[PDB]
Amino acid sequence: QGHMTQRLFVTGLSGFVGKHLQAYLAAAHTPWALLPVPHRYDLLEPDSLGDLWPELPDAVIHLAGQTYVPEAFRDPARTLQINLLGTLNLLQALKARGFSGTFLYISSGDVYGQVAEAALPIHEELIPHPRNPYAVSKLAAESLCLQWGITEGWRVLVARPFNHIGPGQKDSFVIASAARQIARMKQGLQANRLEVGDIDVSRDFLDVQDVLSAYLRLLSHGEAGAVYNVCSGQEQKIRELIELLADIAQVELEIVQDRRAEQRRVRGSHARLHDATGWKPEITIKQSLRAILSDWESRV
Amino acid sequence: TQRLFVTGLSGFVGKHLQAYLAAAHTPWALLPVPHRYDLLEPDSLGDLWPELPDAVIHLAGQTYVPEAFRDPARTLQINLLGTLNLLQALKARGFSGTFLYISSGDVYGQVAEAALPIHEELIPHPRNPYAVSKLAAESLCLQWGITEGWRVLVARPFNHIGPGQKDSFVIASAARQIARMKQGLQANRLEVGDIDVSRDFLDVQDVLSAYLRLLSHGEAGAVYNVCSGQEQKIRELIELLADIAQVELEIVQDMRRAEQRRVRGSHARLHDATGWKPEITIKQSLRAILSDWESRV
Numbered sequence A: 001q002g003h004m005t006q007r008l009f010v011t012g013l014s015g016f017v018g019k020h021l022q023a024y025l026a027a028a029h030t031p032w033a034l035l036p037v038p039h040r041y042d043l044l045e046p047d048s049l050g051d052l053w054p055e056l057p058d059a060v061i062h063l064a065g066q067t068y069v070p071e072a073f074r075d076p077a078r079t080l081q082i083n084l085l086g087t088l089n090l091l092q093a094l095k096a097r098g099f100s101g102t103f104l105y106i107s108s109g110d111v112y113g114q115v116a117e118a119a120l121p122i123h124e125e126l127i128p129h130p131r132n133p134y135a136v137s138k139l140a141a142e143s144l145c146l147q148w149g150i151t152e153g154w155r156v157l158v159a160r161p162f163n164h165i166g167p168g169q170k171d172s173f174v175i176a177s178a179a180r181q182i183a184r185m186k187q188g189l190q191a192n193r194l195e196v197g198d199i200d201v202s203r204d205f206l207d208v209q210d211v212l213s214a215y216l217r218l219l220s221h222g223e224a225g226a227v228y229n230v231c232s233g234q235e236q237k238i239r240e241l242i243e244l245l246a247d248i249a250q251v252e253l254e255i256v257q258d259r260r261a262e263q264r265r266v267r268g269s270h271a272r273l274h275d276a277t278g279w280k281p282e283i284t285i286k287q288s289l290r291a292i293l294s295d296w297e298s299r300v
Numbered sequence B: 001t002q003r004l005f006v007t008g009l010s011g012f013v014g015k016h017l018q019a020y021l022a023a024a025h026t027p028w029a030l031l032p033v034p035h036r037y038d039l040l041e042p043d044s045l046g047d048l049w050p051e052l053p054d055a056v057i058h059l060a061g062q063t064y065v066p067e068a069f070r071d072p073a074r075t076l077q078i079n080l081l082g083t084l085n086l087l088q089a090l091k092a093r094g095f096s097g098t099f100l101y102i103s104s105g106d107v108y109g110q111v112a113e114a115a116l117p118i119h120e121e122l123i124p125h126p127r128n129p130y131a132v133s134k135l136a137a138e139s140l141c142l143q144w145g146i147t148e149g150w151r152v153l154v155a156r157p158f159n160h161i162g163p164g165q166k167d168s169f170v171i172a173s174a175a176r177q178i179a180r181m182k183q184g185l186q187a188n189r190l191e192v193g194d195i196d197v198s199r200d201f202l203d204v205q206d207v208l209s210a211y212l213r214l215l216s217h218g219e220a221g222a223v224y225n226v227c228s229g230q231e232q233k234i235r236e237l238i239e240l241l242a243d244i245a246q247v248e249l250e251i252v253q254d255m256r257r258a259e260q261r262r263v264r265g266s267h268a269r270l271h272d273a274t275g276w277k278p279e280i281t282i283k284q285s286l287r288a289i290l291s292d293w294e295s296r297v
């Protein structure tokens, strides 16, 4: 009956993506059985990691870390400690326990930095040029994890996801903030006015569920030692997404000016991930935007 | 004349750089180091610069690969967080000049022979925690160039040769033992690992010259290999040392085969930016290390 089951441990289960992954694994038919977390742990504290795996994971997805760019600029050392030294502490704890399975490190499409429009769509052979300490720490942790795969013989995979859309996303993202505010307009809690910065840029978006499905297909099919973009391959203009949110919400609003963005356009290539795994995006942008508006209605 | 601050002056490369700068009339005046400091201790860094540097060469760190394997965390602390502490100390002092970070050709990792010579557009694949820490510090320094607007340069030097090199390095060890054989202090027998590999070697003086040229003419935000572009078989260099010493040597195996058999780097980018070329032949370098080892014994 069903799948040959494998034990999966996920760090960061309490964060934005983690909560969606736990729900995904509870509802879907998958070979991955999510291991329980025996107690709270801190990646900065090796003694808190010791007994996390009464049953040994066959695979690990490492989501946990300091994920806010302004916080990384505020305290770069702490972001490096959490994202790089924390990853090292996790790797060493897994090693001491006897782990030798699949380790999928979750990086970010932000490692690429400034990319010329002529180099679009971004592919994994483009040399990255991180522009903030968070992106620096992600690229450094990528290298570390892949070095561990070389040194220890583990199956190490790296994913570079681009823009995510989902309930629970950081309010500092313009699309998440726009949805929150529009849901407040629906309920008469704020005027039909949106104060924006530069929204005449395009970015590559995926629903969080398509991002999750890419990670699980990487666990099933990815090549040891390889880096994969996780992206839609489609540019969306921020302004058109805001207009579609208003349309879905049955609201009319004015967008009012609250410095131009450095990177005007971002399109990623997911050819490598699709060729290796069969993965394809399945959630439409309209469904993604409706989902975040609906989530906000029950919270505002 | 511009003020230059160098970390790691007490190390192998830094001692040669201090000597070089005292000898030649370069555009750089080496700043004094007012007190002993520790890159892991931000409070030791604040008063390091009574006069503000115009340029910095960052040599200091944990340079030994077996030590990095022994304690990866410590090597990442020294090489990455130590670099951050230096960047933050300079920023707080008001520095906004040129920062040259010294990385390593070891960041590249495994490279197919058909892909030689190694150029800077090859994606690096570090294979040990030292190389990881160097690649990570490169990205940190270049990110600081972007965000702070400083002129940040990275050099990826390949194998170095010279007096005062770490004794665990194969050529340095061979030269020391052959110098002892010449004096009769050891039997004419040499225990070696896999010496059937080739590496790209430069005399430390040529490496230093490349760094000084980069300070003056490197392009902000760019990475430069610092290498000879010629492969040297370890077995041949050992034979050359014995020939210079006039020692009849016997090489004995100890026993695993090296992962990378051949390494050759391209200095094309460095040369086109700075006109630099190696000036010291491999034989002249080996004479010098042998002759230094002779006085030592």
Ligand SMILES: NC(=O)C1=CN([C@@H]2O[C@H](COP(=O)(O)OP(=O)(O)OC[C@H]3O[C@@H](n4cnc5c(N)ncnc54)[C@H](OP(=O)(O)O)[C@@H]3O)[C@@H](O)[C@H]2O)C=CC1
Residues within 6 Å of the ligand: A011, A012, A013, A014, A015, A016, A017, A018, A041, A042, A043, A044, A062, A063, A064, A065, A066, A067, A068, A082, A086, A106, A107, A108, A109, A161, A162, A163, A164, A169, A170
């Ligand atoms: N969200 C996005 O838009 C994108 C995300 N990513 C990457 O995806 C991954 C998931 O992001 P997201 O879900 O939004 O992240 P969140 O910030 O929402 O969640 C971070 C998680 O890490 C945990 N964590 C933080 N510090 C530590 C620590 N020192 N020890 C142990 N656990 C710790 C947090 O637990 P607690 O709250 O208890 O501290 C939390 O569960 C990250 O690697 C991120 O960089 C990259 C591209 C896009």
Ligand SMILES: NC(=O)C1=CN([C@@H]2O[C@H](COP(=O)(O)OP(=O)(O)OC[C@H]3O[C@@H](n4cnc5c(N)ncnc54)[C@H](OP(=O)(O)O)[C@@H]3O)[C@@H](O)[C@H]2O)C=CC1
Residues within 6 Å of the ligand: B007, B008, B009, B010, B011, B012, B013, B014, B037, B038, B039, B040, B058, B059, B060, B061, B062, B063, B078, B082, B102, B103, B104, B105, B157, B158, B159, B160
């Ligand atoms: N030597 C070689 O063959 C190669 C070297 N390189 C790179 O070139 C640079 C110079 O190498 P090399 O001269 O051989 O290095 P050494 O190991 O000989 O010298 C290291 C220097 O760093 C200083 N240092 C170490 N830790 C700290 C710390 N926590 N705070 C302050 N200073 C510290 C040491 O001072 P102290 O003695 O007091 O600890 C010393 O001056 C390094 O970045 C190295 O990676 C590149 C490739 C090959």
